[PDB]
Amino acid sequence: PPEAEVQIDRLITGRLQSLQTYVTQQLIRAAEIRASANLAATKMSECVL
Amino acid sequence: VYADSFVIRGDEVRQIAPGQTGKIADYNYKLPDDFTGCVIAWNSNNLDSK
Helix, strand or coil: CCHEEEEEEEEHHHHHHHHHHHHHHHHHHHHHHHHHHHHHHHHHHHCCC | CCCCCCCCCCCCCCCCCCCCCCCHHHHHHCCCCCCCCCCCCCCEEEEEHC
């Protein structure tokens, strides 16, 4: 149980780092997509209408 | 503060510890994995040897 706990803690730290990296990348990509969508909405409202 | 005490042989002193496993460790006295006490052992042959 002790060494299993140590190795499981190492795996937990690695997987948590991976999840945090994925979440941060998703946040940045979502900001980019939000900017693109705001541009698209402005273009629609000012050129279609 | 609990004061559990017993008499064991010299070779199983290591078994009185969190994490260590053995015959006496898992059959006579099993300490918790997270332990916040003190383990004291000393030779006392003259007291109980007839």
